[PDB]
Amino acid sequence: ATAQQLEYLKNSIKSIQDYPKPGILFRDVTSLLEDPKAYALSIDLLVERYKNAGITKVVGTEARGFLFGAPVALGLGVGFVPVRKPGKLPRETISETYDLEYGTDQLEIHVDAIKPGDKVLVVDDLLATGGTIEATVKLIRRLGGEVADAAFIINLFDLGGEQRLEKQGITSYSLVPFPGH
Amino acid sequence: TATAQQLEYLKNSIKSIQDYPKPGILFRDVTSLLEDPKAYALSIDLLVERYKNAGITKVVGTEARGFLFGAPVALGLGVGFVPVRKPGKLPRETISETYDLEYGTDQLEIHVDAIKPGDKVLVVDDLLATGGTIEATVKLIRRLGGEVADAAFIINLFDLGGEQRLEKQGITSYSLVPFPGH
Ligand SMILES: [Cl-]
Ligand SMILES: [Cl-]
């Protein structure tokens, strides 16, 4: 990306000081979604990064993930595979648990959606702890998918997510870096 | 408009699951269309072609399956995408509308700043069933001064009365794949 493209994307994102709490600056991708140029540019740069990488499927987690994975799948000309909250997918699934503050949640994937020989790109809005992406990489590999790549609009470089994913053999590509926890 | 062959390709791309989510029902599963790059691209390209001269200034999609169809149509039209979300997910000032579900009610929210007077909105969703969520979405759009006359769907469950419900709001529905049942 050019410095002009990267600053336009940074400037398209609203930061809500002390949302959802004091000291937390929420990075709001909805202002990017509503801007024709910023949204298109975010998708075009991700497609350009992966066009030669032999990607055969794009995975996006529910729900903001869908907004960036699905357009990147269409731009690469490959299928889109949703990873969802429990009880929403209708065919055979597998499930992975990830930790939150005061408990856990689960993500599910269709078992038939990823096959051995598939090379998968994960795409999400924002890299924070990386917990959800770590669980998504576990789902993909349980299905025999190869995954080495995760792409983000925003990376919160203070929260350790990139290094967490590197422990799984994931290289992260992020358009907009922001500080804050 | 869409060719008969294109419509048959889209209809054949959608899996039907016997006795899900309850016995005697045939669940129309759009995830098989998402997985097929030809069917997914064809669906998006057709919806963009249908509305390319309609003066659309914004596309609205409801969480979550709606995002998979409305956001690519927004990019094809080269207009902004505005999500309508389940409560407590949008971080800035919202308004809310209540709608009916099988076992009660729930709300959808929109950012108050996302639609303005002069906006002409296309609503895009995966599937037209009762139409309750789209009815609520149309109310949100019009509360903000947006015009909305058009909703587009991948699937229309024509037995469930959705299209006629949306006609009572002045909405014309366009759907790619009709199915009987629920
Ligand atoms: Cl949001
Ligand atoms: Cl509906």
Hey, is the C-beta of A16 within 8 angstroms of any chain B C-beta?
yes
Nearest to A60 by CA among A88, A83, A94, A89: A83
The ranges assigned to domains in chain A are 1-181
CB A156 within 8 A of CB A127: yes
Chain B contact set for A16 (CB, 8 A): 91-92
Distance CA A72, CA A89 (A): 21
Hey, is the C-beta of A157 within 8 angstroms of any chain B C-beta?
no
Is the CB of B79 less than 8 angstroms away from the CB of A36?
Answer: yes
Active site residues of B: 65, 102
Query: With the CA atoms of A164, A168, A169 and A174 taken in that order, what torsion angle do they form, in degrees rounded to the nearest 10?
Result: -40
Distance CA B87, CA B108 (A): 6
| In chain A, alpha helices (H) | 3-12, 30-34, 36-50, 64-76, 131-142, 161-166
Alpha carbon of A20 to those of A28, A77, A179, A181, B25: distances in Å?
A: 11, 37, 16, 11, 41
CB B43 within 8 A of CB B68: no
Give the distance from residue B79's alpha carbon to the nearest chain A alpha carbon, in angstroms. Answer: 5
CB B121 within 8 A of CB B56: yes
Is the CB of A20 less than 8 angstroms away from the CB of B67?
Answer: no
Q: How many CA atoms lie within 13 A of B107 on its CB side?
A: 11
List of residues 6+ apart from A151 with CB closer than 8 A:
A46, A49, A50, A68, A72, A121, A122, A123, A124, A172, A173, A174
List of residues 6+ apart from B25 with CB closer than 8 A:
B19, B181, B182
Alpha carbon of A10 to those of A94, A154, B66: distances in Å?
A: 36, 9, 26
Determine how β-strand A146-156 pairs with β-strand A93-100. unpaired
The tokens of B166 are what? 């949306």
At residue B85, what are phi and psi to the nearest 5 degrees? -120, 160
In DSSP terms, which residues pair with B94 in a beta bridge?
B111
Round to the nearest angstrom and report the end-to-end CA distance of chain B: 27
The tokens of A2 are what? 């050019």
Determine how β-strand A93-100 pairs with β-strand A14-17. unpaired
Which position has the token pair 């990075």? A27
Is the CB of A110 less than 8 angstroms away from the CB of B31?
Answer: yes
The tokens of B159 are what? 């037995």
Determine how β-strand B94-101 pairs with β-strand B80-84. unpaired
Convert B24-51 to b/e letters by CB count within 10 Å (16 or more is b). eeebbbbbbbbbbbebbebbbbbbbebb
Of A63, A74, A110, the CB nearest to B72: A74
CB B34 within 8 A of CB A79: yes
A84 is annotated as an active-site residue: no
Find the discontinuities in chain B where C to next N exceeds 2.5 angstroms and give the residue preceding each. Answer: none
